Amino acid sequence: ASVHGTTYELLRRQGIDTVFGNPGSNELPFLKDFPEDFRYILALQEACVVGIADGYAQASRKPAFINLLSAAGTGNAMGALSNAWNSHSPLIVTAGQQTRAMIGVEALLTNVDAANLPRPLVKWSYEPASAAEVPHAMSRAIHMASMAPQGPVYLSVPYDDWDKDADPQSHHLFDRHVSSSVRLNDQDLDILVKALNSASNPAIVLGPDVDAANANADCVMLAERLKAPVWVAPSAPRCPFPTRHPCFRGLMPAGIAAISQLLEGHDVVLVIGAPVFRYHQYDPGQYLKPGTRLISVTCDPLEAARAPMGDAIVADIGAMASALANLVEESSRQLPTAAPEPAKVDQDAGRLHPETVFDTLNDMAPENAIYLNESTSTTAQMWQRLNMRNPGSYYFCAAGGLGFALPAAIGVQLAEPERQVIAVIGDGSANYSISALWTAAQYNIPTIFVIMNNGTYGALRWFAGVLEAENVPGLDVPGIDFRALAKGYGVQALKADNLEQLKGSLQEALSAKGPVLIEVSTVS
Amino acid sequence: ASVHGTTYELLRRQGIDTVFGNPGSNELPFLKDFPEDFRYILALQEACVVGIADGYAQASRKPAFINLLSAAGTGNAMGALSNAWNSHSPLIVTAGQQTRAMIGVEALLTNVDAANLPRPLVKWSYEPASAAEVPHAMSRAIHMASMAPQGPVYLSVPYDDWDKDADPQSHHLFDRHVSSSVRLNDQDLDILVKALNSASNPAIVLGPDVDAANANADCVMLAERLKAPVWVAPSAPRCPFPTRHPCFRGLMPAGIAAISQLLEGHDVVLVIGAPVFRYHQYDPGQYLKPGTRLISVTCDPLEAARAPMGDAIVADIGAMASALANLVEESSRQLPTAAPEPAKVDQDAGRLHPETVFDTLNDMAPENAIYLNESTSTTAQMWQRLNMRNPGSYYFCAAGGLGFALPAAIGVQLAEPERQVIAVIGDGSANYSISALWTAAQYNIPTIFVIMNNGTYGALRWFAGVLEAENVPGLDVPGIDFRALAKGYGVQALKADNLEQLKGSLQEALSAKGPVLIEVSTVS
Amino acid sequence: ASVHGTTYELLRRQGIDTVFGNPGSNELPFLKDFPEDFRYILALQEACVVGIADGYAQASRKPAFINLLSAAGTGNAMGALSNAWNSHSPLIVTAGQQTRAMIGVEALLTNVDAANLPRPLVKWSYEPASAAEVPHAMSRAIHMASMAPQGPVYLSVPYDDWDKDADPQSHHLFDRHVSSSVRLNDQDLDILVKALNSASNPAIVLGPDVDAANANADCVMLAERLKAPVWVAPSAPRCPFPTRHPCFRGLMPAGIAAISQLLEGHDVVLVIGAPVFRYHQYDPGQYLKPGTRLISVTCDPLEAARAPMGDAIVADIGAMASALANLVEESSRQLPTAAPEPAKVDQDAGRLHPETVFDTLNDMAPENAIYLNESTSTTAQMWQRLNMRNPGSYYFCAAGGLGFALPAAIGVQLAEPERQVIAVIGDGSANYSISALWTAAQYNIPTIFVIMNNGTYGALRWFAGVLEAENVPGLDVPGIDFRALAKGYGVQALKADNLEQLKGSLQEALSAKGPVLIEVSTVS
Numbered sequence A, B, C: 001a002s003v004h005g006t007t008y009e010l011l012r013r014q015g016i017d018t019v020f021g022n023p024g025s026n027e028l029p030f031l032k033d034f035p036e037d038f039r040y041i042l043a044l045q046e047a048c049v050v051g052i053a054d055g056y057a058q059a060s061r062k063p064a065f066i067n068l069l070s071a072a073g074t075g076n077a078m079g080a081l082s083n084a085w086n087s088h089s090p091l092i093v094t095a096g097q098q099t100r101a102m103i104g105v106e107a108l109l110t111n112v113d114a115a116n117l118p119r120p121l122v123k124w125s126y127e128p129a130s131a132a133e134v135p136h137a138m139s140r141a142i143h144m145a146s147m148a149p150q151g152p153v154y155l156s157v158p159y160d161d162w163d164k165d166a167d168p169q170s171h172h173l174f175d176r177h178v179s180s181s182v183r184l185n186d187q188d189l190d191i192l193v194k195a196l197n198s199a200s201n202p203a204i205v206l207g208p209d210v211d212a213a214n215a216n217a218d219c220v221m222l223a224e225r226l227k228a229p230v231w232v233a234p235s236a237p238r239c240p241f242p243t244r245h246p247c248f249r250g251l252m253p254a255g256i257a258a259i260s261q262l263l264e265g266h267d268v269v270l271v272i273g274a275p276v277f278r279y280h281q282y283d284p285g286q287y288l289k290p291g292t293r294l295i296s297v298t299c300d301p302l303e304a305a306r307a308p309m310g311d312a313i314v315a316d317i318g319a320m321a322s323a324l325a326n327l328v329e330e331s332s333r334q335l336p337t338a339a340p341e342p343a344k345v346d347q348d349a350g351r352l353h354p355e356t357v358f359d360t361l362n363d364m365a366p367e368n369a370i371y372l373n374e375s376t377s378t379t380a381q382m383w384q385r386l387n388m389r390n391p392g393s394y395y396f397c398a399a400g401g402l403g404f405a406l407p408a409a410i411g412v413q414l415a416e417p418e419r420q421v422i423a424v425i426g427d428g429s430a431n432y433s434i435s436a437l438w439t440a441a442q443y444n445i446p447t448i449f450v451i452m453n454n455g456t457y458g459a460l461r462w463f464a465g466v467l468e469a470e471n472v473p474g475l476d477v478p479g480i481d482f483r484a485l486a487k488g489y490g491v492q493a494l495k496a497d498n499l500e501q502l503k504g505s506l507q508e509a510l511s512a513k514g515p516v517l518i519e520v521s522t523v524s
C-alpha cells in the first residue's frame, strides 16, 4: 500500500471522514484520488477553514481534520488556532511541505522550521523524518488532539511522501483505542464528596469543558443535590448549564475583585471544567474572601498549575461530573430560586437596542437553537436574554480572537443539521472572516447571520472610556454594506432598520432553505 | 517622560510617522493621546494590516510600523509575515500584551510565550523584562528590521508599560544611526572585477533586493558595460530591470534543469540580490552545466549558505551594484538584441484571454504605473506583456502566500501617490484579504483592482494536470460577485465581459478620483 | 513580605527543604539569608548538581529543587536534563537571570531567550514578567513538575526580583493541593478487568513509572492473580519488580523483532508504566505477532500517542495498579516457575569477568542495597545476577546519557540513608561527572562506587563489531587512575585486581563510615 492509501485508511478507521481545507500545490498529492467516502469542505481563506473545522469539532465532540498549504496557509490560520487552544478544540492541522529533494535549497513553498511555526498554540507539532513514518505521525496527531486536555496539533508532510510505499506494520495503527476517561481514585473522591456534603453554602462554577464533555446534565443533577447556585466561569467560550434552571446565576464578571465578592459567604466553591479564572479587565483585590475555599476539577494540567488559589484535581470532566452527581447526598436545604426575568428596555420605532434583538431572538428562535456570539459590547445582555435549555447552545471566541463566529457557525450548523444556528456578530467582527460566507452558500449550510451594525468597535470605545483614554484612532468602521457582502458570496440578505423589520426578517430567515444574513441597524 | 512619550519620540526621530493597525484592548494605552504628527491606517483584519504595511515599506524603501492585538491579532497576520520574510521587508510588528499583573494567571488576551509565536518568520522577536526597557527594545526592533538583510521583527509590550516613567538615559537612542551599507574589500573586489572583465560570455541574474536597493539603474549600466543578457531570478517578488531594455531576457523558469540549460554556454553568471535559486516545480538535473561558474552577491547570509553552487559575497546590494557598475571595463562585444514583441493572441468578442488583458493594460496604463500580481496562472504572460521602465513597478507574494497583493497594492499606492497602482488579482486570490478594500475606500487611496475571474483556482488545475492527479476536490470557486464585494466595502465597481467593455472600464478607472475594482470575465 | 521570604515559605509549605546547587552571582540575592530549616547541597559542576537532585527525587518520590547560574550553568546541566525527561523526574530547575535593568543591553550573565534554552527537555519553561509574579511562577513550577507525567521544569528569575515586595495575595499559593491520582472510569475499568480475566495466556510488562509510583507490590499481586510472566520494558531506567519472584522473566531486549517474538503466544499483553517501547538497536520485524493484543497503561499522553500498536489508557500508575490488582480474578492456572539461577562464569586468578563482580556483589551486599548501573556493556548480566527484592533498587540513565549514575548515586544515598547504595560504573562513564565525588566526601554521603575498568568504551566496540564498522577512532580510554581521582576529591580508594582483592575491598567498603571507590580490573 502507499502512504496515501494507508493514511486515509487510518483516518477512516479513527472516525475521520471530512477534510476542511484550502488547497495548495504541496497538498495535491494528498488530495488526489480523494476517497469517495470522504467529503472536502472548501473555504476561501485559512482562518475560515480552521474556524469552520473548529465549530464542527466543538459541536460534534470529536476531532476535525484540516489541510492547509505550507507556511503561508498555516500562518493565515494562526489567529484561529489561538482560539482553538483556549477552547481545547481537537483539531488535526496538516500542512503540505515541499518535496524532500527541494527542502534544502528552500524552494518556494518550503515551510522552514515547520514545527516551530504554529508554536506555542499547539499541543504537538511535527514533521516526519521519512515517508514511511507519515501514517505513524498521523496516528500520533489524532491521539494527541483527542486526549484530555484536547487541543490542536500540527503535522507537516513533504508532498512526495504520499506516493511512497507504506510500512505494512502500519496496520497496527488503524484500530488503536486511547482513553483518558479517568477520575479521582475512590479514597480521595470520597474525601471530596464528604467536603461537598458538609458544606453549609456551596457554590458551583462551570466552564467550557463541561459542555465539551456533555457533562451538562450531570452538573444539573449535582447542583440540584447540593442545592447550590451555579455560575459560568468568566470569558465563557461555551454554555455549560440550562440558563433558566433555578440554580443558574449567569456569567461571572471577568475580574478578580468582582469574583471574590460574588463568592463571599460561600464556604466551598467547586469549579468544574474551567481555568481559575479567565479574568480580563484589571480589577485588583482578593482572589477569595476569608471563609471561602475553592476546589477545581480541570482536564488540563496547565490550568491546575496556574490557578492562584484553591486545590485542584486533573481528570476527565465527563467522568468526574458523572461520579460527583451520583455520589453526593441530597441536601435538605431549599433549592435556589430562579433569577427574575430580564427587564424590557424601552424601544422606539428607530434603531434597535441590542436588548431588543436578543429578546426577539429568544421569542422567535426554536428551543433547540444554537447561538454564536461575536458582538463584543453586548455579551452580558445576550447571556441574560437567551433561554438556552440544551447543551451545545453557545460559542464565543475562546481566546478573544475575532473572526471565529462567522466560520464557526457554519461548522456548527454542519455538525448539527437539525438545530438552527444563529450567529450574532458585530459589524466590526464580521469582516475578519467575511469570506467564510461563501462556504455556507456553496454547501447550502443554512446558518443565520445576524449582523449588529452600529458603525463602531463599541467594546473598544467602552474600554477607552474606562481608561479615560482620549484621542484613540481607528475605532470607527463606517461604510460597510453587509447586504452587498452577502450578495458577493451568494447568501440571501435582509435588512432590519427597526423592530417590525427585525421581526419580519427573522420570520423569513427562519423559514429559508439556505443561509441568510440579516443586517440590523443597532444603536450607537 | 513616560514610556509612551519616549517611544513616540524615538519613532519620529527614526523616521516613523505612520501606524498600520487593527486596534485592541491591550493597545489602547499605546494608541491613546495618539500624536498629531502621526497617522493611523486602519484595516479590518490583520493579514490586511500587514499586507498594506508591507507594500508601503517595499515601495518606500523604509521600515513600516504595525500594531496588533496580542496572539490572535498576530496570528491572523502570520501568513502575511511569511511573504514579508521572503521579500526582506523591514516591518516592525508590535503586539499588545496583558498588563504585567495579569500575565501569570493567563487572563484573556495574554500572549503566551509571545516571542515564540511569530517564529520562524521574524529576524528578532522579544518581550521586554520591564516597562523602562520598552524604548530600548523598540530601538532594537527598528534597527533589526532595517539592517541588511532587512526583514520583519516582533515586539510584545504589556499594556501597563506605556504610562510608566521612562529612563532619562533613553535619549541616547533617539538619533542612533546604524549602517550596513558595505561592500567587498578593494583587493577582493578587484579580483571579482577582473573575472567579469575576462568573461567571454557573461550573464547577469537579478533578484528582488536589487529593486529594494534601487540598484536598478546601476545594474543597467553594469549589463551595458559587460554586454550581458539579464534575467530575473525565479519566483520574482519584484522587478529589478527595465523590461524592454535590449539586455532583458525575462523571468527565469523556477526549475533546476531549466535554469542550467538557460545558462549553458555562459562562462560566468553573476547573480545579484537573489537567492540561488527560488525554484518551485520539481525539475531535476544539473545545477549548472560544465563550463558555467556562478558568483552570487547577496545581502543575506542565509541565502549565501544555502546556495547549492557558486561563490558568494554577502554585502549591501546598493553598494555592490554601484561599485561594480563603475569599475568594470566597457566590453567591445555587441550589445544584446532586444527581445521581440509578444504575439497578439486571437481574441473574439467574448471572454478575455489573459494576454489580451495585459496587452490592454500596457496600452492604456501610464508609463510609471506600478503593477501587482496575484493572478497565479498568468504570471509568465504578465512578465512578457508589461513594459516596466522604472524601479518599483512590480510586486508578487514573495513566499507564494495569497492575500498579499490586494492589501499591498493599497500600501504601495499610499507610498507612491503619483504613480497609478494596478493590482491584477485572480478571483481565487481576491478573497484571502478581501476586506482590505475598505481601507482604500476610507482613506481614498486610488488603487485600481483588476479581478481576473475564471471561476477556478487555475494554477492548481494546471499543476494537477502535470501530476496527472485526478479527483482533486476544492479547485473551483464559482458564485462570487466581485462588484457586490466592492460595493460592500465602498469601492466603485465595474465589469468587463469583453474587450470593448475592458477598454471602457479601464478608461473610467484611470480617470477616477478613488479606488476602482474591475471584474473581468476571463477564459477558463 | 519580600519575594524572597514568600518564595521560601511557598517552598517549605510544599514540602521542599533542600536546594541542590552550584552558586553564581545572579543567585546570590536568592541564596542570601538562606533559611536555617533548608539545606544546601553543593556540587562542583551542573551536570553533577542535577544528577544528584535527580537521584534524590527518584528515590524520595518527591520533587527536588535545583539552583543554577544563568545560561552557562543551565547549559552544563542539559545532558542531565535529557535523562530526567525520560525518567519523568520531578525536578524544579531555577536559574538566576541578570537584573531587569541590565537584560536589554545583554550584560554578562544575561540568559538570552531564557525559556527556550532547556527546551525541548522540560515540561514547562518560564521567566516571570515582574518580581511580584515570582511566587506564582514558582507555584506553577512545583505543580508542573509534580503532576503526572512528572518531569523537569525551568524557571528563570532576574536577581533583583528577590528583594521586591511580594503580593499579599500570594498566601493563597502556600497550601494548594493538586492531584493527578486518577484511574479509568468504572465502566471501562470493568471492561479491562474482564479482558484480563478472560485471557488464556496473559503477560505483563512493567516500566519505570511503576517503581516511581511504588506500585511494585500491587504489580506482584496482579501477576500472582493472573498467573502471568512479568518482563521489564527495554532500556529500563528503574526496577519495577522483585527479580527473584517466580513470575519474573527479566529485561526485554530493546528490539522490535525480539520483543514480538518473546510475546508470541501471549494473547493479552498488559504494559504498565512504560513507553511502548524504548527500543534501541535496529531489529526490524513485526511489532506484535498475530494472536497478541497489547494494552498499555501509561502516565504520559506522549507515550500513549506514539505507541505503534495496542490500546492505551492514560492515568496514574499507582491508582491503576492498585485497582487492577484488587479487581482481577484469581486464575486457576499454575503460577509461573522461577527462572533458574545464572551460571557461574569460569574465573581465574586474574582480571575480573563482570559476571564475577555481580555475583560477588549479590553475595555480599545487604538485601536492601540499591544499585546504579553505568557499566554499559554489562547490563544484561547485571540484571540476571542481582537479587533486588525491594522497590527503588536500580537506576540507569533513562535517556542513555552517561554522567548520571555517579552523581545520582549520591542523591539516592542521601534520600535513603539506611540503604547501602552501590554504583557500578564503567571506566569510560566515570569521567563524565567525576567531580560529583567531592559532594559525597564533603557531606559524608556513604555511596560505594565500583569502577569497572577495562580501558575501553566496550559497548561501542561491541556495536561497531555489529555494524562491521572498521577504523572507528576514539574507542579507547587508557591511562586513568581512579584511585588518584578519588584521592583528588577526598574519597577513600581501594583497588581490586583479582577476586580475592575484590572480596577484601568490598568487605572494607561495606564497613566504611564514608564513601568508598573501588577500582576493579575487569576483562577487556
Ligand SMILES: Cc1ncc(Cn2c(C)c(CCOP(=O)(O)OP(=O)(O)O)sc2=O)c(N)n1
Pocket: A079, A374, A375, A376, A377, A378, A400, A401, A402, A403, A425, A426, A427, A428, A429, A430, A432, A454, A456, A457, A458, A459, A460, B022, B023, B024, B025, B069, B072, B073, B076
Ligand atoms: C483578531 C482581533 N483583532 C482585534 C481585536 C480587538 N477587538 C475589537 C476590534 C472589538 C470590536 C468589535 O466590534 P463589533 O462591531 O464586532 O462589536 P461591538 O461594536 O459590539 O464591540 S472587541 C476587541 O477585542 C480582537 N479581539 N481580535
Ligand SMILES: Cc1ncc(Cn2c(C)c(CCOP(=O)(O)OP(=O)(O)O)sc2=O)c(N)n1
Pocket: A022, A023, A024, A025, A069, A072, A073, A076, B079, B374, B375, B376, B377, B378, B400, B401, B402, B403, B425, B426, B427, B428, B429, B430, B432, B454, B456, B457, B458, B459, B460
Ligand atoms: C495562502 C495560500 N493559500 C492557498 C494557496 C494555493 N494556491 C491557490 C489557491 C492558487 C489559485 C489562485 O487562484 P486565482 O483565481 O487567484 O488565479 P488563477 O486562476 O490564475 O490560478 S495558486 C496557489 O498556490 C496559496 N499559494 N496561498
Ligand SMILES: Cc1ncc(Cn2c(C)c(CCOP(=O)(O)OP(=O)(O)O)sc2=O)c(N)n1
Pocket: C079, C374, C375, C376, C377, C378, C400, C401, C402, C403, C425, C426, C427, C428, C429, C430, C432, C454, C456, C457, C458, C459, C460
Ligand atoms: C553523554 C554520552 N556521551 C557518549 C555516549 C556514548 N556511549 C559511550 C561512550 C559508551 C561507553 C561507556 O564505557 P564504559 O567504560 O563506561 O562501559 P563499557 O566499557 O562497559 O561499555 S556507551 C555509550 O552509549 C553516551 N551514551 N552518553
Ligand SMILES: [Ca+2]
Pocket: A426, A427, A428, A452, A453, A454, A455, A456, A457, A458
Ligand atoms: Ca459594532
Ligand SMILES: [Ca+2]
Pocket: B426, B427, B428, B452, B453, B454, B455, B456, B457, B458
Ligand atoms: Ca481563477
Ligand SMILES: [Ca+2]
Pocket: C426, C427, C428, C452, C453, C454, C455, C456, C457, C458
Ligand atoms: Ca570500559
Ligand SMILES: [Mg+2]
Pocket: A116, A117, A118, A119, A120, B116, B117, B118, B119, B120
Ligand atoms: Mg511560532
Ligand SMILES: [Mg+2]
Pocket: A060, A414, A415, A416, A417
Ligand atoms: Mg452531526
Ligand SMILES: [Mg+2]
Pocket: B060, B414, B415, B416, B417
Ligand atoms: Mg512616498
Ligand SMILES: [Mg+2]
Pocket: C116, C117, C118, C119, C120
Ligand atoms: Mg534549547
Ligand SMILES: [Mg+2]
Pocket: C060, C414, C415, C416, C417
Ligand atoms: Mg529519605
